[PDB]
Amino acid sequence: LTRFPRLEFIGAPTPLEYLPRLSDYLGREIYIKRDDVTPIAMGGNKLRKLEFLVADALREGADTLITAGAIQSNHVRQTAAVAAKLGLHCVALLENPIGTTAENYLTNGNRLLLDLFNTQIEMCDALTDPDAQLQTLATRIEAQGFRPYVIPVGGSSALGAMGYVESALEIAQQCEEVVGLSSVVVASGSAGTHAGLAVGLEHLMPDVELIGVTVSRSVAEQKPKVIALQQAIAGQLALADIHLWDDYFAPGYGVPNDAGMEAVKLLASLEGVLLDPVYTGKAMAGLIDGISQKRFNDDGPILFIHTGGAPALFAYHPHV
Amino acid sequence: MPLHHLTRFPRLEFIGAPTPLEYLPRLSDYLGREIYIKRDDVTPIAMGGNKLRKLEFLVADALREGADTLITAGAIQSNHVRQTAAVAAKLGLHCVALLENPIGTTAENYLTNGNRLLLDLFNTQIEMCDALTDPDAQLQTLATRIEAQGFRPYVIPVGGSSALGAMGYVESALEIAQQCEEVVGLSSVVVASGSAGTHAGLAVGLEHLMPDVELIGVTVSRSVAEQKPKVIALQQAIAGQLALTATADIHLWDDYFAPGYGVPNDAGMEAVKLLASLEGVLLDPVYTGKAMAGLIDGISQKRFNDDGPILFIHTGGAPALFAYHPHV
Ligand SMILES: Cc1ncc(COP(=O)(O)O)c(CN[C@@H]2CONC2=O)c1O
Ligand SMILES: Cc1ncc(COP(=O)(O)O)c(CN[C@@H]2CONC2=O)c1O
Prior knowledge:
Chain A: Catalyzes the alpha,beta-elimination reaction of D-cysteine and of several D-cysteine derivatives. It could be a defense mechanism against D-cysteine. Chain A is α/β, with parallel strands linked by helices. The first copy, chain A, contains 12 helices and 10 strands.
């Protein structure tokens, strides 16, 4: 996986913990990969990607990082934190994907942390073409005398996803001589984590089924994205079918549903673990329903990749 | 190893590996002095904090008594209560919380968001009192009413700051000393000093492991005269429980909790802003922000014993930011 430059944002491998009380209530061995407890600013999955993204930015001698997402994007917040830490400027192109006017979505949560990180906020109506909108802003910013480095939506490029290809080795090492996995459940947004884990776990764990619970798209729209990135990563590294469930995001991206919210309550009351309304909560709702519908190929132990997002809870409260 | 009597106390592993001890290059560059950070805010259970270390001993004690209910008290946006209720949830124990509004605010986000929001998620029974005048007697009164229902309650004092709870920061001191060994010659340590458990735990530990290192407690609720004896009583109790003598003088600065506990000040907010924008580290309005403001002004006024490296203990508190936004 090396030969690609990488910074040290995590260092120690993130915890893999048994969930006894959730396993109790579900009657099935459930494990959790705690990528939410990464050391930088309340954590998240994007640290793994930014280790490669910002390492590439320093090689190209950038002084400014530019990315995009929702107002309450964890990715934007993690990007801003890393930038501040390294002395790099940060420009954010943000949108309101749900059209709310609630003070806490507009000003609290991840968006509040952006003000603290001194992030140059740029508002747009819709991210209809993010790659081309970032490119525009990057020209404007470099015209102002800066050296910008564009980071894609969720940092979900072939290089970005290398963080989660590497992440598979951690899982393989932590599970070995302790637990024999059967299934792995992960949230599938911009496909960065899901494609990354697909390539890695194909080689490092043969008899495991990777399930991608979508948060924004249907199977028809998500399949082409996860396949393409998988074949980009495999080609980049000189090296299996994609499995997706799309029932567990109700009205769309960035809107809470009853199943996802109750999943949040479940893992907080039983395990003291904090999920989020947008990603992990919905991803967990699929996991619970997967056992319920016996949608997994067998009744063996399941691993949930906690990708973070907990700071969103403070923005979505009380409602949106 | 003069701290070997620490083995006598039963302990539940909540942290695992030692928390990061990181150098802060940009802040060091700004302040003109080598600054290090002990990251106890990155403990794995429910957004972290200093109280997790203390709960490791207190909850282990609770289980040995066969208790099924943790009862504790604090502010509505207390970090201790939140961490307590998170541990209680993880171990299948009921949690009863006695909460006060300590600043008389009516802001929605202070009353319902932040730490208070997480309390609901952990299924915490909430008891609202008007003022925490006598927290020990109020917690006792509540315990009787809770056990009359049939619960087997274990009372945890404010901030978990008994001699037993404070053992988690004699533990921390040992981590610090090991991590600094032949890597950094420490001169000073800055920590927030609230209910005194962290400060006193660090006081006892550091006196025996890093005797030449100066320890500074930046008060967040009280003056030197009022805070001094609280830290000392714990200091001496902790030492006695570990078969040790503690002769070190406690040091405190009270110039940085502006109008009172839980009320943000200008120097605090700038300390929060400074570390966020320079290091991507998130402080809080109530504790670490004011403790950092004391470190900065301590450097500014030449208040430390010398010019050497300063370790800042990041005790956590960050979830309060969302509660204290936009104002109180
Ligand atoms: C907590 C959390 N979980 C899951 C995801 C989804 O993972 P991938 O992006 O790797 O698929 C994201 C970010 N992703 C969102 C989805 O859209 N844009 C983003 O930044 C996230 O912040
Ligand atoms: C982040 C943080 N720092 C410091 C403290 C105070 O440290 P000691 O209590 O160990 O001195 C607390 C909680 N303590 C407050 C202080 O009073 N009541 C409480 O619950 C806290 O949450």
